[PDB]
Amino acid sequence: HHLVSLEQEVQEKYSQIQNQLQRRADLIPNLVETVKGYAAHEKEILEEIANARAKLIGAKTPQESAQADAELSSALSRLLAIAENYPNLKADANFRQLMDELAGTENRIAVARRDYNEAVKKYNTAIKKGFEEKQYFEAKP
Template sequence: MKRSTWIWVIIGAVVLLAVFSGISTYNSLVSAETSVAGKFSQIDNNLQRRADLIPNLVNTVKGYAAHEKEVLQAIADARSKLVGAQTPAEKAAADAELSSALSRLLVVVENYPTLKADTQFSRLMDELAGTENRIAVARKDYNDAVEQYNVKIRQFPGSLYASMFGFGPKEFFKAAPGSEKAPEVKF
């Protein structure tokens, strides 16, 4: 073979290698982005489950603590915000507000021993506790997926393809400011 033929073969091989590398990296980025969306959807599902449990819990408490309207209203308001939140930051803030309102509800429950003994209330509290655990796991899974995705779009050669195809960084699910402090419970 002539020298010019070898040069064209080498150039062709390099071009094919670049194309296959680009396709592989692009598919990897799409897969990582889809994983992030799926994990966020799991947070959403669990937050919705929790929001669906709240009205039953509130109605059970209403029968015992009808005069505790402000706590029950705070829960209803926080639940509405959570259901309407769209972004991870909005959901985190609404989740923190709902958690705070629920902790105030638990203080109210302490004043009603018969309510604590009610089987429906106990069952709802167990469901809520299970849902809280699911939410924590879903948040961790989501943040892990976001971390992996963000690393992929920042590392070479992924960063080249990410900028070329419009893949941007994803937002972590962060706790609301002040949530690191335990709620103050007074009897």
């Protein structure tokens, strides 16, 4: 009874995370386009962003997706510091709307990660008495 239903919860909370990560990856091409419009010579940061998108696209496991998401968040923070050198970019409405949507997704991921890891703990705890231990959403070193 409980294993099936606890497994069920783990999976439903996981899809909340996946839905946000997918939206994150989806917004990235538009962002890159907007940045290139104002700052074509900031190639390193645009590459870092593209790389983290691909990592997110290829992630197989919760740990890999979390690591990929942290790489993205870090590259987004670095983009924002760089944007200070480009006032017209910093003021661009599409750029602001996009960094705001991206921050919103990440803030959602924060909540959804706590719900997921809560369901992972109950689940893993129950199985310690077809049902495999699940990974926590967290980036390892």
